[PDB]
């Protein structure tokens, strides 16, 4: 218990040595499924090392990303409110291709809960970075040309297969982004 307190503080100054240390004292098995679940209940974690580890492109970090996108659920949920949930459980690692990589995961797993909305996972992808970026362009103020509703759903045409989303889960999710910035964890 104090040893796992100590594992808690480790994880969080050193993802790879906290979970080196967890695995090595028998606190946690090592297997990308009891790891994913270690940081998807984030108790005692700080949610930058989670998303630090998370972040890793070694294989194993990878099927842990992959394990740990699958314990989020993301049924009957529109692509922000999902994004939202996802956004909150650990800290967006800065470099690009890692962010990449991790929405790459979170589209796959929308999908998966929400077949249907999506021709494919990739127009969820490219979905996804639309609003990302429409977060930043609304609530940044650096960004003095703000996207209108219109410029958003003109911006996103062709991306469904070819051709455009129905406006309506456009200007719904551009609403939410517009009412509330995503917060973004520490």
Not at 73 to 89: C, G, I, K, M, Y
Not at 114 to 142: E, K, W
Not at 156 to 181: A, F, H, Q
Request: aromatic letters at 10%.
């Amino acid at each position: 218990n104090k040893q796992v307190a100590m594992g808690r503080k480790k994880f969080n100054m050193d993802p790879k040595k906290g979970i080196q240390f967890l695995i090595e004292n028998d606190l946690l098995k090592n297997t990308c499924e009891d790891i994913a679940q270690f940081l998807y209940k984030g108790e005692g974690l700080n949610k930058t090392a989670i998303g630090d580890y998370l972040g890793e492109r070694d294989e194993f970090n990878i099927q842990v990303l992959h394990a740990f996108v699958e314990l989020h659920e993301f049924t009957d949920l529109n692509l922000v409110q999902a994004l939202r949930q996802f956004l909150w459980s650990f800290r967006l690692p800065g470099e690009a291709q890692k962010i990449d990589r991790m929405m790459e995961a979170f589209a796959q797993r929308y999908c998966q809960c929400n077949n249907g909305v999506f021709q494919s996972t990739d127009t969820c992808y490219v979905l996804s970075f639309a609003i990302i970026m429409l977060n930043t362009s609304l609530h940044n103020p650096n960004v003095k040309d703000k996207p209108t509703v219109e410029r958003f759903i003109a911006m996103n045409r062709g991306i469904n297969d070819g051709g455009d989303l129905p406006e309506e889960l456009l200007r719904n999710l551009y609403e939410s982004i517009k009412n509330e910035p995503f917060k973004i964890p520490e």
